[PDB]
Amino acid sequence: PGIVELPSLEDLKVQEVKVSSSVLKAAAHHYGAQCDKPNKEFMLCRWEEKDPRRCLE
Amino acid sequence: DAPEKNYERTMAILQIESEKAELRLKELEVRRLMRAKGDGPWFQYPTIDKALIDHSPKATPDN
Numbered sequence A: 001p002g003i004v005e006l007p008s009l010e011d012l013k014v015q016e017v018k019v020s021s022s023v024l025k026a027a028a029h030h031y032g033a034q035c036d037k038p039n040k041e042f043m044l045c046r047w048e049e050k051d052p053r054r055c056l057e
Numbered sequence B: 001d002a003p004e005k006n007y008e009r010t011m012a013i014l015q016i017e018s019e020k021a022e023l024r025l026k027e028l029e030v031r032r033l034m035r036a037k038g039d040g041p042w043f044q045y046p047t048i049d050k051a052l053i054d055h056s057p058k059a060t061p062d063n
Helices: A021-026 A028-033 A036-049 B001-037
Strands: none
Touching: A021 A028, A028 A036
16 A cells, blocks of 8 residues: 655654653642643644644644 | 227236336346345445444544
């Protein structure tokens, strides 16, 4: 059939939030309250178009 | 009975039977074409209804 599409490795590179799971769990409620807008935009788009290749930015 | 009565009775009988015979042949050909192509109301084997599909947002996006 069709050749499957995949973004290049330069499109996937990003600075990483390099912390343990305890750091995330401790400040989970503050992170959820303060950063709701880009998280919810990403969640809406990711649930809407059902594609991780179109949900990278 | 009169010969005219038997004559016209025979003509009515022949017309009725010719109509029935042509309808029987049409029924056979209709059945064959309907079974071959499948588009008519006959030979419509049921498939899965689409009202049994859950269209809510699920717990995983890739679906």
